[PDB]
Amino acid sequence: GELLHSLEGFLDCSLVLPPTDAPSEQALLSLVPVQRELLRRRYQS
Amino acid sequence: DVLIKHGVMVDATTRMGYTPLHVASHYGNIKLVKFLLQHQADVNAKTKLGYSPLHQAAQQGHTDIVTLLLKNGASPNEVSSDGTTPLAIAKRLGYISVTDVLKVVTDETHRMSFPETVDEIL
Amino acid sequence: PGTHKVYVELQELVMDEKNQELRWMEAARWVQLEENLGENGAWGRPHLSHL
């Protein structure tokens, strides 16, 4: 159960990036706060 | 396990306010940190100088105790009477791994805490 | 002592060539960053592990 809970927390802070027709390399830099907050959410309770 | 089943107080404090969770975090014994936290230890307990079990782990460089204490409710922003936060201490002694973990959870803003020891020997 | 750092190795059940016999051979290794073994026999560039 502890392993399953850790994996649920792992998936809760995983960032799914869906397909898009235009990879701009700049709209990808708009998800820097998202990744930062998802890490704070894994490192925190 | 034997002591806790007997009825020993989990959050006993020394003269300067150190709990067994403070000492286990200080000395890098993560299995007992988990054991103490499973038995209702105060993760945010403070000594007389305001040091958390998370300031001891950050001061001694134990990155995995830092992670386990944060995940069990430790505060990365509570400050001590000396004016240090669990991260400033990590930056002061240059623990890159502890700074990297405590940097994510700590928001934007020369004394070392040592638990008492027994020097008795025969 | 209670927790150590972890080096991860990925091994797959593959069949070779000269013998057509099944063997466990390494495909990837994780030391902080992940490395994958190519067909030529060289470990590739370290990379973030996308899933």
XYZ file of C-alpha atoms in Angstrom:
218
model
C 0.000 0.000 0.000
C 2.864 2.398 0.700
C 4.339 1.677 -2.736
C 0.939 2.198 -4.360
C 0.489 5.501 -2.509
C 3.944 6.652 -3.618
C 3.066 5.736 -7.208
C -0.235 7.639 -6.957
C 1.740 10.677 -5.824
C 4.179 10.074 -8.686
C 1.316 10.116 -11.199
C -0.355 13.125 -9.543
C 2.765 15.218 -10.242
C 3.383 13.850 -13.746
C 2.938 16.332 -16.589
C 1.190 14.852 -19.630
C 2.044 16.782 -22.794
C -0.595 16.116 -25.485
C 0.174 16.223 -29.215
C -0.088 19.594 -30.939
C 0.331 20.584 -34.567
C 2.738 23.485 -33.916
C 5.819 22.873 -31.729
C 6.994 26.421 -31.091
C 9.670 25.824 -28.380
C 8.214 28.941 -26.702
C 4.758 27.728 -25.692
C 6.693 24.810 -24.203
C 8.409 27.390 -21.987
C 5.009 28.437 -20.632
C 4.875 25.165 -18.659
C 7.956 25.955 -16.551
C 5.718 27.108 -13.640
C 3.608 23.967 -14.081
C 6.616 21.670 -13.727
C 7.941 23.703 -10.791
C 4.608 23.472 -8.961
C 4.264 19.751 -9.712
C 7.721 19.179 -8.145
C 6.768 21.227 -5.031
C 3.668 19.018 -4.870
C 5.775 15.757 -4.947
C 8.485 17.074 -2.554
C 5.654 18.307 -0.223
C 2.928 16.208 1.427
C 9.510 -0.613 19.390
C 9.959 -2.050 22.893
C 10.151 1.413 24.467
C 7.098 2.789 22.644
C 4.999 -0.262 23.556
C 5.918 0.258 27.217
C 4.490 3.782 27.303
C 7.531 5.978 26.721
C 6.709 9.545 25.689
C 7.546 9.921 21.997
C 8.059 13.702 22.224
C 10.253 13.847 25.327
C 12.372 16.995 25.403
C 15.882 17.487 26.746
C 17.106 20.602 28.565
C 17.423 22.552 25.302
C 14.214 21.178 23.793
C 15.426 18.320 21.599
C 12.980 15.508 20.848
C 13.968 12.005 19.691
C 12.821 13.109 16.232
C 15.385 15.919 16.453
C 18.136 13.440 17.334
C 17.175 10.870 14.693
C 17.068 13.582 12.024
C 20.395 14.967 13.275
C 22.249 11.647 13.103
C 20.821 10.426 9.794
C 18.748 7.483 11.068
C 15.871 7.558 8.594
C 14.317 4.250 9.681
C 13.761 5.605 13.183
C 12.523 8.912 11.743
C 9.848 6.906 9.934
C 9.175 4.906 13.104
C 8.817 8.049 15.224
C 6.575 9.749 12.660
C 4.413 6.618 12.544
C 3.962 6.996 16.323
C 2.726 10.609 16.298
C 5.981 12.517 16.692
C 5.844 16.280 16.184
C 7.423 16.856 12.777
C 7.374 20.636 13.382
C 8.652 20.516 16.968
C 10.992 23.340 17.931
C 13.795 23.535 20.477
C 14.394 26.501 22.783
C 16.425 28.100 19.978
C 13.678 27.335 17.456
C 15.340 24.497 15.546
C 13.098 21.989 13.768
C 13.911 18.362 13.099
C 14.220 19.676 9.436
C 16.916 22.209 10.376
C 18.953 19.384 11.899
C 18.638 17.248 8.760
C 19.548 20.203 6.541
C 22.451 21.209 8.801
C 23.938 17.697 8.773
C 23.322 17.197 5.045
C 20.906 14.250 5.188
C 18.959 14.729 1.955
C 16.690 11.701 2.408
C 15.648 12.756 5.913
C 14.913 16.186 4.422
C 12.662 14.548 1.826
C 10.941 12.251 4.324
C 10.374 15.118 6.831
C 8.917 17.434 4.146
C 6.521 14.635 2.998
C 5.366 14.149 6.611
C 4.536 17.823 7.166
C 7.761 19.685 7.864
C 7.703 23.414 7.196
C 10.429 24.846 4.982
C 9.721 28.453 6.113
C 9.647 28.339 9.938
C 12.750 30.235 11.184
C 14.872 29.766 14.302
C 15.876 32.210 17.030
C 19.242 32.534 15.267
C 17.456 33.836 12.164
C 18.140 30.847 9.892
C 15.568 28.809 7.804
C 16.217 25.079 7.082
C 17.565 26.187 3.611
C 19.818 29.132 4.470
C 21.615 26.573 6.643
C 21.915 24.236 3.652
C 23.388 27.080 1.596
C 25.720 28.064 4.451
C 27.480 24.676 4.658
C 27.150 24.151 0.897
C 25.034 20.990 0.755
C 24.007 21.043 -2.908
C 21.607 18.091 -2.674
C 19.849 19.432 0.431
C 19.742 22.920 -1.096
C 18.268 21.539 -4.328
C 15.405 19.739 -2.541
C 14.701 22.538 0.017
C 14.967 25.153 -2.826
C 11.804 23.752 -4.543
C 9.650 23.881 -1.357
C 11.077 27.127 0.138
C 9.549 30.479 -0.969
C 11.363 33.690 -1.791
C 12.631 35.795 1.107
C 26.852 31.356 12.203
C 25.431 29.085 14.911
C 25.206 25.291 14.686
C 22.613 23.376 16.703
C 23.927 20.220 18.379
C 21.835 17.860 20.532
C 23.240 16.969 23.920
C 25.233 13.755 24.179
C 26.388 11.327 26.856
C 30.163 11.265 27.348
C 30.079 8.528 30.005
C 32.499 5.633 29.535
C 33.980 3.072 31.912
C 22.669 3.696 5.712
C 18.884 3.413 5.837
C 18.456 4.636 2.257
C 21.115 4.619 -0.458
C 21.169 6.052 -3.941
C 19.917 3.648 -6.594
C 21.453 2.609 -9.913
C 18.787 1.076 -12.159
C 19.379 -1.367 -15.013
C 16.760 -2.436 -17.566
C 17.210 -5.904 -19.073
C 15.020 -7.529 -21.725
C 14.622 -11.160 -22.766
C 16.169 -11.086 -26.246
C 17.363 -13.785 -28.659
C 20.902 -13.411 -30.031
C 21.904 -14.441 -33.584
C 24.615 -17.113 -33.874
C 22.678 -19.434 -31.493
C 19.008 -18.344 -31.506
C 19.029 -18.892 -27.731
C 17.223 -16.551 -25.300
C 19.328 -14.359 -22.936
C 18.729 -11.377 -20.611
C 20.616 -8.416 -22.104
C 20.687 -4.803 -20.871
C 18.755 -2.059 -22.738
C 18.895 0.956 -20.379
C 20.629 2.216 -17.215
C 19.578 5.048 -14.904
C 22.316 6.961 -12.988
C 20.476 10.222 -12.305
C 19.927 10.448 -16.104
C 19.005 7.470 -18.398
C 21.175 5.842 -21.067
C 19.962 3.343 -23.675
C 22.095 0.678 -25.416
C 21.876 0.789 -29.200
C 22.241 -1.958 -31.765
C 25.888 -1.076 -32.439
C 26.883 -1.590 -28.794
C 27.477 1.934 -27.545
C 25.624 3.568 -24.629
C 23.844 6.684 -25.969
C 23.663 10.254 -24.651
C 22.267 10.657 -21.118
C 18.638 11.979 -21.322
C 15.634 12.912 -19.180
C 13.314 9.930 -18.825
C 10.128 10.685 -20.753
C 7.371 8.100 -20.381
